[PDB]
Amino acid sequence: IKAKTYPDFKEFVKDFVANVKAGKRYDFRKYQEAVLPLTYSSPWPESDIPEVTDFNYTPDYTVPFSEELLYSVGAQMRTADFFMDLQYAIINGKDVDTVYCEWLARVKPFSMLNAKLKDS
């Protein structure tokens, strides 16, 4: 994912899930501040997000909260953790319909991001 290729977050996450569906996996929880631009209306990503080949992520909680929600409405988690938990859902067979980012205000360490999930 090359830097500043997508003019907003909505079009960024549209091809982030598509890349994950294609077998591409990402991990940036250690250098999170270097890849997320501030404000969701800024071009995404701030810097190029490299691919990884050793993606082995097993979270300590049930990532699919309901059958149609990644987190309970109002749950706050680290922004880098949102992408990992989202990637966990696509791997296990859940499809992403809409990523909830309309009224969100923060991208850095903690953000209230959510996704509406679907089968297949």
Binding site: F28, K30, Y31, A34, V35, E46, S47, D48, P50
Partner: protein, 52 residues
């Protein structure tokens, strides 16, 4: 003595610059071998336009 060259790797977004600066200070401290206390932060770093 072998010349010390520090590759900052500023192109990628996950290069720990703190580690490279610490390498510079540690090399200026250990390799002096003057028998006195060395302040590795007392250096001149002259760079060109591209590196800056």
């Amino acid at each position: 003595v072998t010349k010390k060259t520090i590759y900052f790797d500023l192109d990628n977004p996950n290069s720990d610059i703190d580690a490279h600066i610490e390498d510079l200070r540690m090399h200026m401290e250990d390799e002096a071998k003057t028998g006195t206390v060395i302040n590795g932060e007392e250096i001149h770093i002259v760079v060109d336009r591209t590196f800056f």
